[PDB]
Amino acid sequence: PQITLWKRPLVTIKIGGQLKEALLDTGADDTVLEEMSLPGRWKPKMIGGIGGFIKVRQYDQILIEICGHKAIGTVLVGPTPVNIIGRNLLTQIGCTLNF
Amino acid sequence: PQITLWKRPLVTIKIGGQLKEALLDTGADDTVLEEMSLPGRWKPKMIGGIGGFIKVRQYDQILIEICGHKAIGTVLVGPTPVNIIGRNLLTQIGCTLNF
Numbered sequence: 743p744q745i746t747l748w749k750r751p752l753v754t755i756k757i758g759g760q761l762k763e764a765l766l767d768t769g770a771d772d773t774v775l776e777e778m779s780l781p782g783r784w785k786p787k788m789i790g791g792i793g794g795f796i797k798v799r800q801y802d803q804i805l806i807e808i809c810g811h812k813a814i815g816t817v818l819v820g821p822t823p824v825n826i827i828g829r830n831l832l833t834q835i836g837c838t839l840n841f
Numbered sequence: 842p843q844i845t846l847w848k849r850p851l852v853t854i855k856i857g858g859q860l861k862e863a864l865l866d867t868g869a870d871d872t873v874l875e876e877m878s879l880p881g882r883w884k885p886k887m888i889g890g891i892g893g894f895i896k897v898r899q900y901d902q903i904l905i906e907i908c909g910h911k912a913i914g915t916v917l918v919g920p921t922p923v924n925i926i927g928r929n930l931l932t933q934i935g936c937t938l939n940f
């Protein structure tokens with residue numbers, strides 16, 4: 743579908759058998775979720791944004807369904823104040839910007 | 842035009858008679874630029890992101906040209922590490938998300 747930007751581009755995602763809401767975010771290279779229960783191993787990480795840096799857990803090859811589109815890829819989990827879908831998954835679901 | 846997300850969606854902008862590069866960013870409600878010389882009055886402000894909060898200067902009704910599309914609107918200026926175009930201007934240039 744097409745989505746306009748008069749409101750936040752929020753979508754429903756399924757990950758780890760849990761349902762969540764997340765922001766389609768073209769300015770994020772990576773996908774970052776608030777703390778949640780995930781299975782398997784993780785690598786410790788740091789990412790920066792406006793405001794300063796956060797330590798996150800990098801999870802690889804995780805399956806995620808994004809407004810019904812499956813994707814598999816890296817998901818970082820940590821103190822973000824908003825669930826964010828970044829370019830690493832946006833490309834896999836065929837998402838593009840048009841103006 | 843259409844832009845895919847395998848790379849950062851960076852565009853050229855003109856603002857205050859200066860040329861800059863900026864990130865098309867669907868997860869930003871507002872437009873935020875690194876420190877720059879702007880004319881006229883500004884209001885003091887605070888915005889939050891991943892990482893913590895920043896104080897910014899809110900400038901209103903500023904003209905900005907975004908990859909050749911004019912827009913007029915609020916522009917926040919401050920310690921952001923990347924020039925960001927947010928939804929308040931993305932809608933004015935007719936930008937949309939498609940998947």
Ligand SMILES: COc1ccc(S(=O)(=O)N(CC(C)C)C[C@@H](O)[C@H](Cc2ccccc2)n2cc(COC(=O)N[C@@H]3c4ccccc4C[C@H]3O)nn2)cc1
Binds near residue numbers: 826888921
């Ligand atoms: C009040 O109006 C606002 C306008 C913008 C923002 S935002 O914080 O800038 N925002 C939303 C966010 C809090 C989820 C937009 C978001 O796309 C930003 C863009 C950004 C990126 C880098 C610096 C400042 C702004 N965003 C992106 C990410 C996650 O980013 C990454 O995937 N990692 C890269 C990375 C990793 C280490 C160091 C620097 C960077 C730059 C990144 O592109 N978090 N927020 C908040 C309020």
